[PDB]
Design an enzyme around this catalytic site. Structure first.
Site, PDB file in Angstrom:
ATOM      1  CG  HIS A 158      -2.073  -1.095   1.006  1.00  0.00           C
ATOM      2  ND1 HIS A 158      -3.179  -1.245   1.831  1.00  0.00           N
ATOM      3  CD2 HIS A 158      -2.137  -2.013  -0.044  1.00  0.00           C
ATOM      4  CE1 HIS A 158      -3.886  -2.271   1.292  1.00  0.00           C
ATOM      5  NE2 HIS A 158      -3.315  -2.716   0.205  1.00  0.00           N
ATOM      6  N   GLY A 183       5.377   6.659  -4.725  1.00  0.00           N
ATOM      7  CA  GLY A 183       5.831   5.276  -4.661  1.00  0.00           C
ATOM      8  C   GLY A 183       6.229   4.833  -3.267  1.00  0.00           C
ATOM      9  CG  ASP A 222       6.314   8.296  -0.880  1.00  0.00           C
ATOM     10  OD1 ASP A 222       5.538   7.445  -0.455  1.00  0.00           O
ATOM     11  OD2 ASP A 222       5.891   9.325  -1.388  1.00  0.00           O
ATOM     12  CB  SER A 280       3.535   8.796   1.566  1.00  0.00           C
ATOM     13  OG  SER A 280       2.919   7.773   0.784  1.00  0.00           O
ATOM     14  CG  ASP A 295      -1.123 -20.687   2.295  1.00  0.00           C
ATOM     15  OD1 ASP A 295      -0.876 -20.561   3.492  1.00  0.00           O
ATOM     16  OD2 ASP A 295      -0.240 -20.685   1.452  1.00  0.00           O
ATOM     17  CB  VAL A 308       5.181 -22.572   5.443  1.00  0.00           C
ATOM     18  CG1 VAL A 308       6.291 -23.147   4.599  1.00  0.00           C
ATOM     19  CG2 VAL A 308       5.113 -23.232   6.806  1.00  0.00           C
ATOM     20  CG  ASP A 355       3.661 -23.139   1.561  1.00  0.00           C
ATOM     21  OD1 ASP A 355       2.798 -22.272   1.417  1.00  0.00           O
ATOM     22  OD2 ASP A 355       3.526 -24.022   2.396  1.00  0.00           O
TER      23      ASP A 355
HETATM   24 CA   LIG Z   1       3.703   5.874  -0.676  1.00  0.00          CA
HETATM   25 CA   LIG Z   2       1.682 -20.673   3.015  1.00  0.00          CA
END
Ligand SMILES: [Ca+2]
Ligand SMILES: [Ca+2]
Ligand code: HEM
Ligand SMILES: *[C@@H]1O[C@H](CO)[C@@H](O[C@@H]2O[C@H](CO)[C@@H](O)[C@H](O)[C@H]2NC(C)=O)[C@H](O)[C@H]1NC(C)=O
Ligand SMILES: [K+]
Length: 336
Positions: free
Chosen positions: A48, A67, A69, A71, A194, A199, A201
């Site tokens: 995010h 990006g 950064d 923020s 999962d 793990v 995987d």
């Molecule tokens: Ca950011």
């Molecule tokens: Ca897993």
């Protein structure tokens, strides 16, 4: 040549402070180097933070976002109000304090904490770590975060604008191998995505391909689908990307090899870590990142289900021959 105060040897003097923030995060943030909720939360935060970057907004004369950064920490007041950023507040505050105490930029700290958190989870690759991102940032524009109810077209377009190909979107989703949800269906808090939330995987790619059979909670939450067994949660975006012709063959190729998945994941994460930056202007301190314990288990289709319960969606390559297990169907406990 370069020795750091505690006797470790590094490539650059700029890497030495990271040995101190390593000890602080392992002892405190990760509660003694564990692979539990702090790692999972940090993996949401690195995504995010980095995805608030839009070349299209920049092209239209708009601030497109900086990006990776930091923020999301510096302007948490604006960014944590976004709908996809809930449940992060407590981790963001913990991270703010470490960044301020060590004097490291927030953007670098989030990348570092991701590499180090993943090292506590068995089966993880050693992620690249670069330092030097400026601490200065502006709040990310709204609406740049993919949500679980979006169509595959919407996710691929948003991810593609940031810079990812359909294949890299699938590669990036290997982080759902260490994941659960808290806010989509709170009746089944920390329900895993999962069967091995601790793990790193291939099981996430296998299990999302299995026919949805089970409703794991009293009702269905936001963007929730039927999953293959009690205790497992399946979100709609994951179910759809597994089955969509644009991403289905890459999803299928991620099911039989933990080594292949690991490499692809590390590559995709190194690209995401420098969105908004020139990697050639950063210093490489990857040697500060420690190894994870290795995962020796084979990929399996769980609890008696066979290849006949997989909804094979890649029309060109036949499904990998994976191992089956002589068991009853699993009930998954909450992720720790
Ligand atoms: Ca950011
Ligand atoms: Ca897993
Ligand atoms: C591109 C599509 C993606 C969508 C739509 C998406 C959506 C979600 C949603 C809805 C949750 C549950 C949050 C909650 O209620 O607690 C989740 C959890 C998670 N996601 Fe994703 N995700 C995506 C990509 C990624 C990426 C690229 C990463 C990081 C590399 C990531 C890492 C995780 C982790 C580790 C969790 C588990 C958090 C926890 O257990 O507390 N996700 N994701
Ligand atoms: C990076 O910038 C942030 C945002 O300006 C700085 O964070 C502030 O730090 C002071 C202490 O120096 C705290 O009292 C504030 O509460 C912080 N504000 C926020 C929003 O976190 C941070 O110190 C800067 N870090 C470096 C290394 O320059
Ligand atoms: K490979």
């Amino acid at each position: 040549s370069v020795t750091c105060p505690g006797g470790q040897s590094t490539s650059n003097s700029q890497c030495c402070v990271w040995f101190d923030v390593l000890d602080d995060l392992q002892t405190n943030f990760y509660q003694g180097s564990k692979c539990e909720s702090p790692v999972r939360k940090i993996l949401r935060i690195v995504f995010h933070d980095a995805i608030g970057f839009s070349p299209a907004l920049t092209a239209a004369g708009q601030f497109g976002g900086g990006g990776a950064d930091g923020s999301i920490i510096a302007h948490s007041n604006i960014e944590l109000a976004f709908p996809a950023n809930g449940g992060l507040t407590d981790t963001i505050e913990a991270l703010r304090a470490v960044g301020i105490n060590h004097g490291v930029s927030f953007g670098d700290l989030i990348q570092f904490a991701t590499a180090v958190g993943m090292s506590n989870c068995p089966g993880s690759p050693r992620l690249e770590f670069l330092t030097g991102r400026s601490n200065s940032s502006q709040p990310s524009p709204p609406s740049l975060i993919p949500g679980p109810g979006n169509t595959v077209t919407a996710i691929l377009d948003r991810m593609g604008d940031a810079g990812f190909s359909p294949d890299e979107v699938v590669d990036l989703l290997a982080a759902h191998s260490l994941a659960s949800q808290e806010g989509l269906n709170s009746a089944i808090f920390r329900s895993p995505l999962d069967s091995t939330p601790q793990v790193f995987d291939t099981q996430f790619y296998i299990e999302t391909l299995l026919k949805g059979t089970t409703q794991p909670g009293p009702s269905l939450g936001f963007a929730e689908e039927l999953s293959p067994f009690p205790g497992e949660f399946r979100m709609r975006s994951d179910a759809l990307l597994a089955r969509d012709s644009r991403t289905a063959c890459r999803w299928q190729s991620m099911t039989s090899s933990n080594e292949v998945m690991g490499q692809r994941y590390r590559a995709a994460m190194a690209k995401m870590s420098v969105l908004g930056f020139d990697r050639n202007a950063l210093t490489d301190c990857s040697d500060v990142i420690p190894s994870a314990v290795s995962n020796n288990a084979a990929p399996v289709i769980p609890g008696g289900l066979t290849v006949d319960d997989i909804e094979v969606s890649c029309p060109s390559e036949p499904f990998p021959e994976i191992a089956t297990a002589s068991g009853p169907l699993p009930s998954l406990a909450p992720a720790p």
